[PDB]
Amino acid sequence: SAAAEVLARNQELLTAIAAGNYEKYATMCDPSMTCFEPEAVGHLVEGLDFHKYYFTMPSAPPAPDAPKPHVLNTMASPHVRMVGDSCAVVSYIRLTQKMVNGAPVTVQAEETRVWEKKDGGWIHVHMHRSLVK
Amino acid sequence: MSAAAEVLARNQELLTAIAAGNYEKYATMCDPSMTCFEPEAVGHLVEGLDFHKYYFTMPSAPPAPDAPKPHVLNTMASPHVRMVGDSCAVVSYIRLTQKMVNGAPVTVQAEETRVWEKKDGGWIHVHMHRSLVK
Amino acid sequence: MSAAAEVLARNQELLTAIAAGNYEKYATMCDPSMTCFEPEAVGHLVEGLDFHKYYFTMPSAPPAPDAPKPHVLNTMASPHVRMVGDSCAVVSYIRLTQKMVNGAPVTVQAEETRVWEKKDGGWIHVHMHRSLVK
Amino acid sequence: SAAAEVLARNQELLTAIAAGNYEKYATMCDPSMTCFEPEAVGHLVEGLDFHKYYFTMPSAPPAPDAPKPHVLNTMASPHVRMVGDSCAVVSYIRLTQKMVNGAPVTVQAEETRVWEKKDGGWIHVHMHRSLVK
Amino acid sequence: SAAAEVLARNQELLTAIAAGNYEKYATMCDPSMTCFEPEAVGHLVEGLDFHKYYFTMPSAPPPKPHVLNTMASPHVRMVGDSCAVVSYIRLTQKMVNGAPVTVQAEETRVWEKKDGGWIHVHMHRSLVK
Amino acid sequence: MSAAAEVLARNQELLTAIAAGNYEKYATMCDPSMTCFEPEAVGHLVEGLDFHKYYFTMPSAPPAPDAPKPHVLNTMASPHVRMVGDSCAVVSYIRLTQKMVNGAPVTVQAEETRVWEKKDGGWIHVHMHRSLVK
């Protein structure tokens, strides 16, 4: 049941990432969060500004027309491990369905996200993201 | 005198066991329910020790007058230890493996996140995530 | 809190000043006799500030042709500060620069060593060694 | 005069490296020394074991064709900077003359080596190498 | 401090070259100056006319010339009372298309002390890469 | 007899010593602090005599029956000697080396500038600048 709560928090974080909602994202992450990810080109980054960069990219007005963002994140075969009462490790395959050149594309990545039970709530502390060929 | 130094040394001990081909020590250091992301798992989450034991027990040709000793060294570049609650430790680092191929040195790099749990007065490896860097 | 922490903060100040194109701040933080290894020096050791002033004073096409404000962020991956005596600090790290090329973000990575001297009641950058990774 | 001492020590260190004399090399370095170099493939390494690896390689059998290695390190245009009483920064272009396939070749690298004065001697604390090409 | 004078004079000469100021350049050079350089395509050139050629090329009116010369790792050698040899790597930062480019050249420049001041008598330029 | 002619003779003597591989005479003629630009220095200024001693002391042992005595000749095409004060000479020329490659003769050309200092009644080589034409 606790594992289900951590899974809900993880899916909530993923939807916040897909929406570009940086405030929700930052509210879910500890300011000392550690991260391996492809954008970090092989190095361990600490903090939130590195991702705030990607949330605040300069795009600004587009032509309204009829297209709107269409992105969906799916946690393929999730695995929750409880290490003590205050720690949870969520390991899964992140499947991101996105639109490129008017066509759908499914991106896959191995993701390990560590959550700490701080001040009543689960908070993300560490992420390891690796792309699969 | 710190628990973070202890888990760091324990992780280095695990890497030494891996480099030595000592599967008995590796198995004594890992929980039988250990989960693993690694390149050999070709994009999937594997559980258990048999998948890793496969690589310790590969059929090798007996040694000849060649270079009768493996020259392998693992280095934890810029380690980071995080204590998550009373029973968990997360060790994140860049694994640098110096090995010999065709009589020449080669340095392999990988992003590694290893999770340890405090069980029975020791630290046991429960989850690993390996990523090759181009 | 700590001298090493202060030197690290000064290095982050210098990097943000570089990202913002503020040459006056940059020169305020650098010794006039500063030495430098960097790719722009094409394999030689350069001395002085004019060599770096060159890249701050490059002529540019007319600003704001429906173009956004510069979106650049420097991050010191795994910083290491070494105090060598009272008045010397060596800050070694991996500089990760997130910038915009065309419409997409790109992260550039360099190995950076920056040597700072405590003179006249302030930390001043005196040496730099930069090497591109990829 | 002090700069002359540090320069002589740096040349002695390079000679030790060229000779495969790991003992002298290690006695000249601080055990916590930091290093950027190509063999570290874009990361900062600490300690001497990473470098000890290269002194302790599995030796190939001698076949009397080139019994003595012909290698020489040259510090092209050295520059010494005194940063306080106990620090010296030695920057130079390391030119290694080696023999490849019976013909000589000159390899060049940018080198920054930091030395600390402990008691009345100099020890190596930090190195930064970058191949020039 | 004599080496400082010769280095300052060489830097002044290089800035004159970068600025296209042939008058200052010529006033700093001995009229019998000898020269090895790429533009000499493998021959030893004597005099100032050969170099004057490049200051007086025909151009068009129509950004701004952004060029900077740096003497990387200079080396001054006093050979007797009247001679100085300045060896260095000339790093020229120029702009091609919209991008900066650093050109490197091995430069040896010989100077002679004649009463008051140093004058340039011999130069050797080699392109590295 | 002129002093410039004497320095020219000393320079031809040095080139002969280089062609013969006689490192001892070469070292006698050169100041221990001599500076050098040359292709083998891959675009840098080297100081001292060890850098050049490296090429006199390269490994080799038996003269094969396939090849005979070395046939090498250095020629100073259009020499120019310039006296800079009492004790300094600059010898500039095109070095033409006739050597044997395989079974055929070939002429290598290089732009050479050699500075000589008058110390204790003798001329010694103090600085060289060597560049290849083709």
Side-chain angles (χ1 to χ4, degrees):
Chain A
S1 182
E5 188 178 348
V6 187
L7 276 175
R9 260 294 236 196
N10 201 113
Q11 182 66 240
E12 203 186 345
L13 180 76
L14 291 184
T15 57
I17 296 174
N21 188 343
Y22 176 75
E23 282 66 28
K24 200 58 189 141
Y25 180 84
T27 318
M28 301 194 198
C29 300
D30 182 310
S32 65
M33 171 189 54
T34 51
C35 166
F36 283 130
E37 73 175 53
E39 294 83 344
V41 289
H43 303 281
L44 186 62
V45 291
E46 190 168 357
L48 283 156
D49 297 326
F50 189 86
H51 311 97
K52 186 184 180 184
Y53 183 95
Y54 297 128
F55 281 82
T56 61
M57 297 183 37
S59 183
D65 271 6
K68 288 298 178 180
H70 193 232
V71 172
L72 176 63
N73 288 281
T74 302
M75 297 188 305
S77 292
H79 170 92
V80 188
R81 180 184 299 273
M82 301 299 306
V83 197
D85 279 326
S86 309
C87 180
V89 186
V90 182
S91 313
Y92 54 88
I93 298 293
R94 180 175 172 185
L95 300 178
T96 300
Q97 298 162 284
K98 57 191 294 184
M99 290 296 163
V100 292
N101 295 334
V105 155
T106 303
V107 167
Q108 50 174 331
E110 304 165 320
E111 279 201 2
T112 302
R113 292 194 185 266
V114 185
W115 297 80
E116 185 174 13
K117 185 191 295 182
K118 291 170 103 163
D119 301 326
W122 290 102
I123 277 200
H124 192 240
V125 293
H126 176 72
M127 62 172 292
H128 193 158
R129 185 168 184 262
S130 54
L131 280 178
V132 182
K133 306 176 180 178
Chain B
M1 197 183 94
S2 176
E6 291 185 5
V7 291
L8 204 62
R10 181 70 157 166
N11 201 99
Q12 182 66 48
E13 185 180 10
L14 179 73
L15 293 183
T16 311
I18 295 170
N22 186 351
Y23 175 72
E24 280 70 8
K25 184 143 192 49
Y26 181 83
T28 57
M29 274 185 292
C30 296
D31 186 309
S33 71
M34 163 194 47
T35 44
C36 160
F37 283 133
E38 73 177 6
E40 297 86 345
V42 288
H44 303 98
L45 181 74
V46 303
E47 189 187 42
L49 286 152
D50 304 75
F51 188 88
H52 306 103
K53 187 182 183 178
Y54 181 89
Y55 298 105
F56 291 89
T57 60
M58 304 189 296
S60 63
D66 179 72
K69 193 64 203 307
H71 192 40
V72 173
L73 174 61
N74 290 282
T75 304
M76 295 190 302
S78 297
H80 179 285
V81 180
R82 163 178 279 111
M83 296 297 179
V84 195
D86 44 315
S87 308
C88 186
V90 184
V91 180
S92 310
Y93 56 93
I94 295 296
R95 172 119 170 256
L96 295 182
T97 303
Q98 302 157 275
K99 57 179 182 180
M100 291 285 142
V101 299
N102 295 335
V106 151
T107 302
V108 165
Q109 52 179 329
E111 308 166 316
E112 283 202 10
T113 298
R114 290 193 187 262
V115 183
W116 300 82
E117 175 171 32
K118 189 86 175 192
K119 281 187 175 178
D120 299 358
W123 289 97
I124 302 297
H125 187 38
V126 297
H127 178 69
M128 63 179 272
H129 192 152
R130 291 196 63 210
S131 311
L132 280 179
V133 178
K134 190 107 171 199
Chain C
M1 49 154 293
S2 172
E6 189 187 336
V7 182
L8 201 62
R10 284 286 282 184
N11 200 83
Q12 186 62 48
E13 293 185 34
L14 181 77
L15 286 181
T16 53
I18 293 175
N22 188 346
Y23 172 78
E24 212 209 352
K25 190 71 184 302
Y26 179 87
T28 302
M29 307 186 71
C30 294
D31 190 80
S33 69
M34 168 186 55
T35 43
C36 168
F37 283 122
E38 76 178 4
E40 292 83 346
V42 293
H44 301 279
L45 178 67
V46 301
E47 192 169 354
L49 282 154
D50 296 332
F51 193 97
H52 304 103
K53 186 189 185 67
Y54 184 95
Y55 298 94
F56 287 80
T57 60
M58 292 184 310
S60 60
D66 61 282
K69 286 289 179 175
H71 196 241
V72 176
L73 177 60
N74 287 282
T75 302
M76 299 187 300
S78 290
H80 173 90
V81 188
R82 169 186 307 273
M83 303 297 306
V84 194
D86 185 22
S87 310
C88 184
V90 181
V91 181
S92 308
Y93 56 97
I94 294 293
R95 187 175 171 190
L96 301 182
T97 307
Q98 302 166 281
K99 59 180 183 179
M100 291 297 167
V101 176
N102 299 330
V106 161
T107 303
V108 186
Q109 54 173 302
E111 306 163 323
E112 288 215 348
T113 301
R114 291 197 188 262
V115 182
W116 299 77
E117 175 173 337
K118 190 230 282 191
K119 50 202 294 178
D120 305 328
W123 286 104
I124 272 192
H125 186 219
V126 303
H127 183 65
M128 69 170 300
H129 193 147
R130 251 220 301 163
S131 49
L132 272 184
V133 178
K134 59 172 179 290
Chain D
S1 188
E5 289 185 20
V6 193
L7 208 65
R9 278 231 98 181
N10 201 95
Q11 185 63 47
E12 188 178 22
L13 183 77
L14 295 180
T15 301
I17 297 177
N21 183 349
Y22 175 76
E23 294 176 8
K24 204 168 197 183
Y25 175 87
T27 55
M28 295 184 62
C29 302
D30 182 312
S32 74
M33 75 165 177
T34 43
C35 159
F36 282 125
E37 76 175 3
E39 295 83 347
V41 290
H43 301 280
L44 180 62
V45 302
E46 184 174 0
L48 283 150
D49 294 310
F50 189 91
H51 310 93
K52 188 182 178 176
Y53 181 89
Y54 300 89
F55 292 83
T56 58
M57 296 192 186
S59 61
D65 188 10
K68 186 68 182 182
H70 197 47
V71 172
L72 172 60
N73 288 280
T74 303
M75 301 181 60
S77 294
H79 174 277
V80 186
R81 168 184 308 256
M82 296 304 178
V83 194
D85 324 75
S86 47
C87 184
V89 188
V90 180
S91 314
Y92 57 104
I93 298 296
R94 180 175 171 187
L95 297 183
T96 309
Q97 302 158 278
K98 57 174 107 178
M99 297 295 301
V100 173
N101 293 5
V105 70
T106 305
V107 167
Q108 43 166 337
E110 302 161 323
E111 283 208 0
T112 301
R113 295 192 182 265
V114 183
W115 299 79
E116 179 170 27
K117 191 182 184 63
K118 295 184 178 173
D119 54 77
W122 292 96
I123 67 164
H124 184 43
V125 300
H126 180 67
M127 62 180 270
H128 192 148
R129 300 186 59 212
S130 39
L131 271 190
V132 173
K133 235 41 179 181
Chain E
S1 188
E5 288 187 18
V6 193
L7 276 182
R9 285 290 283 177
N10 203 97
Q11 187 65 44
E12 196 184 358
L13 186 78
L14 293 179
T15 56
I17 297 177
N21 186 345
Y22 176 76
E23 296 180 358
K24 226 192 183 193
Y25 172 85
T27 54
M28 294 189 225
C29 299
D30 184 297
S32 70
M33 169 184 56
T34 42
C35 169
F36 284 123
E37 73 178 8
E39 293 85 344
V41 294
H43 304 283
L44 182 60
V45 177
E46 198 166 354
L48 281 154
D49 298 8
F50 192 98
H51 308 102
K52 188 184 182 180
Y53 183 90
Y54 300 99
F55 292 82
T56 59
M57 295 184 302
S59 182
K64 269 285 301 170
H66 197 242
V67 173
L68 179 57
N69 290 276
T70 303
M71 301 185 304
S73 294
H75 171 90
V76 186
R77 170 183 304 252
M78 307 298 311
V79 192
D81 292 321
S82 310
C83 188
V85 186
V86 181
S87 304
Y88 58 101
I89 295 294
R90 183 177 169 188
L91 299 181
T92 312
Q93 302 159 275
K94 56 184 188 180
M95 298 287 296
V96 296
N97 297 334
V101 156
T102 307
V103 165
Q104 51 181 334
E106 304 170 324
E107 279 204 4
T108 302
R109 291 193 184 266
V110 186
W111 298 75
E112 185 176 17
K113 183 195 284 188
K114 295 183 91 75
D115 289 285
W118 293 90
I119 62 161
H120 183 43
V121 298
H122 177 68
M123 64 174 298
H124 197 151
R125 276 229 308 166
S126 303
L127 279 182
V128 182
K129 184 178 58 60
Chain F
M1 183 195 59
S2 176
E6 183 179 344
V7 183
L8 198 67
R10 278 285 282 188
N11 204 79
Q12 185 62 48
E13 195 188 357
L14 179 75
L15 291 185
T16 297
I18 296 175
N22 186 345
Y23 171 75
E24 284 66 19
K25 203 172 189 179
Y26 177 87
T28 57
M29 301 192 196
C30 294
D31 183 297
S33 64
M34 68 172 299
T35 42
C36 168
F37 280 131
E38 77 178 2
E40 295 84 344
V42 290
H44 300 275
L45 181 68
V46 293
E47 190 168 358
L49 282 162
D50 297 4
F51 193 96
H52 305 100
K53 187 183 184 181
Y54 182 90
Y55 299 87
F56 290 85
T57 49
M58 291 182 308
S60 295
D66 179 8
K69 296 178 179 180
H71 196 43
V72 175
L73 180 56
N74 287 284
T75 300
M76 298 185 301
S78 291
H80 176 286
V81 190
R82 171 196 304 273
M83 303 297 307
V84 194
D86 187 18
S87 309
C88 183
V90 184
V91 182
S92 308
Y93 56 102
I94 294 294
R95 183 177 175 185
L96 301 181
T97 308
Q98 298 163 289
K99 59 183 185 178
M100 290 302 232
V101 173
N102 298 330
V106 70
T107 305
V108 164
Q109 57 180 346
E111 306 168 322
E112 283 206 357
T113 301
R114 293 191 184 268
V115 182
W116 297 76
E117 182 165 12
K118 186 195 293 186
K119 290 187 178 174
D120 274 359
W123 288 101
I124 61 169
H125 182 41
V126 298
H127 176 75
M128 66 172 301
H129 194 151
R130 187 169 122 94
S131 58
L132 264 44
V133 185
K134 65 166 298 177

